[PDB]
Amino acid sequence: DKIRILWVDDEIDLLKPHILFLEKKNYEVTTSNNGLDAIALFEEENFDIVFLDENMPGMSGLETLSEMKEKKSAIPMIMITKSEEEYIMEEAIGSKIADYLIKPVNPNQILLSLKKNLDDSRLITEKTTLDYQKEFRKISMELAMVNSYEDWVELYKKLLFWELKLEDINDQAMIEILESQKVEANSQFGKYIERNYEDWFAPKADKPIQSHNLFKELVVPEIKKKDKPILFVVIDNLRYDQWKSFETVISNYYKLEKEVPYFSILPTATQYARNAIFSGLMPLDMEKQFPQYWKNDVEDGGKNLYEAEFLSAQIKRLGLNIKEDYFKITNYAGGKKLAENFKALKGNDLVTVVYNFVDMLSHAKTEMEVVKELASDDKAYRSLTLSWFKNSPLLEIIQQAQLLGFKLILTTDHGTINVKNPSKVVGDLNLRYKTGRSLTYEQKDVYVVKEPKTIGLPAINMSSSFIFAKNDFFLAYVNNYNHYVSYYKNTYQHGGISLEEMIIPFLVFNPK
Amino acid sequence: DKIRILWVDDEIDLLKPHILFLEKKNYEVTTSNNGLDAIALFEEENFDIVFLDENMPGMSGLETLSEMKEKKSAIPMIMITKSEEEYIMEEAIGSKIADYLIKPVNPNQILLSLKKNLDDSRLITEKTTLDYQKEFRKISMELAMVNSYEDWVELYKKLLFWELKLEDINDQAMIEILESQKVEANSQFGKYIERNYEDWFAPKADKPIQSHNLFKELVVPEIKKKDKPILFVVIDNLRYDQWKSFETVISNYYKLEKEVPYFSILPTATQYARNAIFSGLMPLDMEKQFPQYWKNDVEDGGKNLYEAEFLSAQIKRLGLNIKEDYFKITNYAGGKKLAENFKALKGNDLVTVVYNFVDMLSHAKTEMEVVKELASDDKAYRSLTLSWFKNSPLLEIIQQAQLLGFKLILTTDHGTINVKNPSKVVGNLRYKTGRSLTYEQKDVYVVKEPKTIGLPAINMSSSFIFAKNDFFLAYVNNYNHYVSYYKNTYQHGGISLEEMIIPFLVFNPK
Ligand SMILES: [Mg+2]
Ligand SMILES: [Mg+2]
Ligand SMILES: [Zn+2]
Ligand SMILES: [Zn+2]
Ligand SMILES: [Zn+2]
Ligand SMILES: [Zn+2]
């Protein structure tokens, strides 16, 4: 019932006030004056934590710790010693010491170390649970008052902060409260976009940075600095909560210098948003200025085959004379090949890398039972994304760029949303947007644009219209309605309006 | 270069010796005497770490911490304060403080905290690399001296310990040395099994616990204790290293009482090993005693459809009068359904649950490009398995059993191995049974009389071959296509530490 401590020190008799203090706090303390006797004790009994002196006659604390870690690696071990040498600090940290306390140590410092190493996950759960109970009413109130794109960014950031904090907590009732705030936030954001989207295209409108502005406004100033070559990575289909899931992994190689949440253009689909990043033009202007590259929905083949050409035309148009190359990664083998030969690009000013894995992974949830279990909810999907990133050729490419002193620019073209509710469409395959001459649809469920050219979109031919699903709706054809509902319900789809699909990260980092 | 520190304290002028000490160690220090001014600086500038006083006029150190974590949650924050109250310690730990130092603080204690929070992964990499450099020759020596099944279990445990230890090191030479020891271990283990396997079937032989002995020897004594209902989970195709990857997750709900590494029977395939768990009979005895349930390789349909029937016959045969139920989970929906209705099984003595996800996931890497990237190497596969377990209906079922005070028995039928080298065959990629097989003798353990190792046979013509090492049996007819497609895939059925030495775990709910 009591927490058992094994304390190893050659002068353990001189530390009796610490033992008495800890026994008052309900800790059980077992002492040892030599590393070898402590190892025998540790093998016979089940201690919750070990305290070790470094400098002892015979076996050192680091030698003793090494034998105990081999026998029970999950038991935390703390160094409490007079040793102040940095090389001893480094050897102990490197040996996975849970803490290092320099003598004379305050008995409350030992107590802090005990609480931090043994009760932290419980304390974090209780603190987060209590903090959210006191915060949710203020979130709902802030949600009701959001009336601008900057307030939407801040509200989305607040929801994302509580989502990653609450994912681990036991309280299902509170998890459901946050989920209701998320669906209400998406309901208000879809009406905000319906209401202001077209106005953003008017001359000198107050609008956020969008897909077609991204390269000129945020990448070009980094290039003009001319201090470091740039690795510009566009991870297709990266939700903001997916970046937050691997932010601390990337911090081991890159120090975040700038973060700019930006808005993807509509539709939040690759063919439109990703090509607009590389060309710096709206789809209607890409059709007008580059008919040889732009492809409308009705044309067969790949919709993003000419991004290098679009990018080189944008770079030339902006007056830059740089050494730049484009790579599109569609599979493991290609990612690995680019990671292995990255040094060949050392002399480049810009290296653009499109990485498709996360988009293919989001769509695999529709097609594969194994991905349905791996990404059953938003928490599972974040966990799966973090597992991917940590073991990906993309991280190996990022590590190669860090070794060459490259600045890292990490961004995406759009996010994706788990669709839950069907919405009947009649048209002529994307579940969150549809374009065509005579579309039949539910007015309340979609943002309708009857003149696509007003929002920089090509009109296939004069009576063409664009509909964009709002909330968690999926556009389902009446033709085989029950089969579309059954198959596409609870799958990740992008193309329409939501915080997940539209508000996306633009990140700049310096190598460390 | 230079690590940037933001230090917030109302008595920041009294801390100048600490600042000068840190500046000498190449740290850049920015000071602030109030939490609100520190929040303004923290938003405008990119600091690597923040030091905060708890008691300040105006915003407290915990109120300031809370604003700073909301703005940039990835930056470590340390509290440096005179407060010694346990409730302040708890509120700070609960707020995800990286460290908490009580004033008067030794300047070297701050330096330790800086090194531990900012350089630990690099220091751990360097220390682990050197520890393995000084250990690898002793591992090779131990490997050469292994001459028993118990020494194999201990050597496998040692290799698994270093595999997890090394999984993030950069030193290619060391990574290759470990890999070489793993291939050499499977080589020696294959020779050890090729000798010893048949002898283990002789009366009163010194043999390890196998598939057909598992239930009677290790589950039945737990049932005979009679002071907790048992949830018996068989996760199909669970490598020892996959159990080691989620061991600390399961420790949040269950305390490990007993661990018994056991040996799967040959072939290390579900049809044989998993049915032998549930029947407590070798496949040849399952064919003889239950012809209505046992299915040979040539019969179409599911090969593990009658495990509840086999289990109930074993339980009846062992003299047990228990309330028992069997569940086979083949998909997410069924797993979720069992988690949702677990309480209906509260009054049971035994609840057996077969969980197929990990086997389906190992096979998905062969075909799906997305799974090739998620499980490209052994480290990625462990990471993927840990991501799965943490968010699985299986863990929800385990949590439901913990709430009901059930004892947990966690085991598997076999592991799997990443195959790398082809081996020609004519007539599963790790075992083959048939009448008159053509094969490479050096690459397989050959049993020309399958009944001698408790396996079925049709006249003296049929035999079984079991791939050793990382070999995969590729048909001569379509050789180049089999090699190209199945190279670097997870396959089970043959002999390896990964396939054969598997965990049997007993836990008490906490
Ligand atoms: Mg000493
Ligand atoms: Mg103060
Ligand atoms: Zn895309
Ligand atoms: Zn997509
Ligand atoms: Zn199996
Ligand atoms: Zn299998």
Strands (E), B141-253: 230-235
Q: How far is the CA of A272 from the centre of ligand 3 (A)?
A: 9
What is residue B451's three-state secondary structure? helix
Q: How far is the CA of B313 from the centre of ligand 4 (A)?
A: 51
The alpha-carbon radius of gyration of chain A (Å, integer) is 28
Contact A371 B372 (CB under 8 A): no
For chain A, give the number of residues: 512
Q: How far is the CA of A18 from the centre of ligand 2 (A)?
A: 26
Structure tokens at B16: 């100048």
| A93 at interface of B, judged by CB pairs closer than 8 A | yes
Are B364 and B371 in contact by the 8 Å Cβ rule? The answer is: yes
Spell A81-109 as b/e; 16+ CB within 10 A means b.
bebeeeebbbbbbbbbbbbbbbeebbbbb
List phi, psi (to 5°) of A31: -105, 160
List phi, psi (to 5°) of B480: -60, -35
The DSSP symbol for A219 reads I
Looking up tokens 């000129």 gives A216
Ligand-binding annotation for A10, yes or no, is yes
The bridge status of strand A324-329 relative to strand A350-355 is parallel
CB contact residues (below 8 A), chain A span 25-54, against chain B: none
DSSP state letters, A406-438: -EEEEE-S---EEE-EEEEEB----SSEEEESS
Q: Please tell me the experimental approach by which this structure was elucidated.
A: X-ray
- Distance (Å, rounded) from C-alpha B27 to C-alpha B484? 54
Ligand-binding annotation for A46, yes or no, is no
Contact A111 B392 (CB under 8 A): no
Instruction: For ligand 2, an ion, list residues with CB under 5 A.
Output: B 10, 53, 55
- Distance (Å, rounded) from C-alpha A481 to C-alpha A491? 16
Residue A259: CA atoms inside 13 Å, Cβ hemisphere, count? 18
Closest to A68 measured CA to CA, from A89, A23, A109, A98: A98
Closest to A508 measured CA to CA, from B5, B48, B46, B1: B46
* Angle (CA) A329 A332 A333, round 5°: 90
| A196 at interface of B, judged by CB pairs closer than 8 A | no
What is residue B101's three-state secondary structure? strand
- Distance (Å, rounded) from C-alpha B306 to C-alpha B311? 9
Spell A3-37 as b/e; 16+ CB within 10 A means b.
bebbbbbbebeebeebbeebeeeebebbbbbbbee
Q: How many CB atoms lie within 10 A of CB A264?
A: 24
Within 8 A of B112 by CB-CB distance, chain A residues are 89, 100, 102
| B371 at interface of A, judged by CB pairs closer than 8 A | yes
Q: Which of A99, A373, A386 sits opposite B357 (nearest CB)?
A: A373
Give residue limits of the domains in chain A: 3-118, 124-196, 206-416+501-511, 418-493
Q: How far is the CA of B492 from the centre of ligand 5 (A)?
A: 8
CA distances from B279 to B90, B208, B218, B236, B335 (A): 52, 18, 14, 16, 24
A-B C-beta contacts closer than 8 Å: 167
* Stretch (H or E) spanning B279: helix B270-279
Closest to B283 measured CA to CA, from B212, B373, B213: B212
- Distance (Å, rounded) from C-alpha A26 to C-alpha B184? 50
* Angle (CA) B395 B399 B400, round 5°: 120
Ligand-binding annotation for A236, yes or no, is yes
- Distance (Å, rounded) from C-alpha A92 to C-alpha A280? 52
* Angle (CA) B116 A391 B159, round 5°: 75
B425 DSSP β-pair partners: B439, B475
CA distances from A128 to A135, A142, A174, A408, B78 (A): 10, 20, 11, 33, 19
Residue of A nearest to B117 (CA): A93
Spell A345-382 as b/e; 16+ CB within 10 A means b.
beebbbbbbbbbbbbbbbbbbeebbbbbbbbbebbbbb
Are B350 and B326 in contact by the 8 Å Cβ rule? The answer is: no
Contact B90 A380 (CB under 8 A): no
CA B166 to chain centre: 15
Q: For residue A175, with 0-12 CB atoms within 10 Å meaning exposed, 13-18 middle and 19 or more buried, which class applies?
A: middle
For chain B, give the number of residues: 510
The bridge status of strand A407-411 relative to strand A506-511 is antiparallel
| B124 at interface of A, judged by CB pairs closer than 8 A | yes
Looking up tokens 């004594």 gives B221
* Closest ligand by atom to A413 CA: 3
B351 DSSP β-pair partners: B231, B325
Within 8 A of B376 by CB-CB distance, chain A residues are 332, 391
CA distances from A248 to B75, B204, B384 (A): 9, 56, 18
Are A164 and A241 in contact by the 8 Å Cβ rule? The answer is: yes
Which amino acid, one-letter code, is at A294? Answer: W
Residue of B nearest to A369 (CA): B331
CA distances from B388 to A77, A125, A132, A348, B289 (A): 29, 22, 27, 40, 39
Q: What architecture is domain B206-416+499-509?
A: 3-Layer(aba) Sandwich (3.40)
Closest to A132 measured CA to CA, from A94, A181, A92, A91: A181
| A124 at interface of B, judged by CB pairs closer than 8 A | yes
The bridge status of strand B421-426 relative to strand B438-439 is antiparallel
Residue of A nearest to B380 (CA): A391
Three-state helix/strand/coil letters over A79-137: EEECCCCHHHHHHHHHCCCCEEEECCCCHHHHHHHHHHHHCHHHHHHHHHHHHHHCCHH
Within 8 A of B172 by CB-CB distance, chain A residues are none
Structure tokens at B369: 């490009």
Three-state helix/strand/coil letters over B380-409: HHHHHHHHHHHCCHHHHHHHHHHHCCCEEE
Closest to A189 measured CA to CA, from A443, A416, A470: A470
**What residues of B are designated binding site for Mg(2+)?**
10, 53, 55
Within 8 A of B251 by CB-CB distance, chain A residues are 74
* Closest ligand by atom to A493 CA: 4
- Distance (Å, rounded) from C-alpha B195 to C-alpha B219? 29
Residue of A nearest to B116 (CA): A93
Within 8 A of A248 by CB-CB distance, chain B residues are 74
| B484 at interface of A, judged by CB pairs closer than 8 A | no
- Distance (Å, rounded) from C-alpha A428 to C-alpha A438? 9
Q: Which of A127, A370, A390 sits opposite B371 (nearest CB)?
A: A370
Domain boundaries A3-118, corresponding CATH code = 3.40.50.2300
Instruction: For ligand 3, an ion, list residues with CB under 5 A.
Output: A 236-237, 270, 413
Ligand-binding annotation for A13, yes or no, is no
DSSP state letters, A130-197: HHHHTTHHHHHHHHHH--SHHHHHHHHHHHHHHHHHHTT-S-HHHHHHHHHHHHHHHHHHHHHHHHHT
**What residues of B are designated binding site for Zn(2+)?**
236, 270, 359, 363, 413-414, 492
Are B268 and B499 in contact by the 8 Å Cβ rule? The answer is: yes
List phi, psi (to 5°) of A440: -100, 130
Q: How far is the CA of A212 from the centre of ligand 3 (A)?
A: 14
Q: How many CB atoms lie within 10 A of CB A40?
A: 11
Contact B102 A108 (CB under 8 A): yes
CB contact residues (below 8 A), chain A span 213-272, against chain B: 247-248, 251-252, 255-257
Task: Please tell me the distance in Å from B508's CA to the nearest CA on chain A.
Answer: 15
Are A275 and A307 in contact by the 8 Å Cβ rule? The answer is: yes
Within 8 A of A371 by CB-CB distance, chain B residues are 370
- The widest CA-to-CA distance across chain B, in whole angstroms, is 93
Instruction: Return the CATH fold of A206-416+501-511.
Output: Alkaline Phosphatase, subunit A (3.40.720)
- Distance (Å, rounded) from C-alpha B328 to C-alpha A254? 46
* Closest ligand by atom to B359 CA: 6
Contact B374 A393 (CB under 8 A): no
Task: Show contacts of B153-157: CB within 8 Å, 24+ apart.
Answer: B153/B208, B153/B261, B153/B501, B155/B185, B156/B185, B156/B240, B156/B261, B156/B497, B156/B501, B157/B261
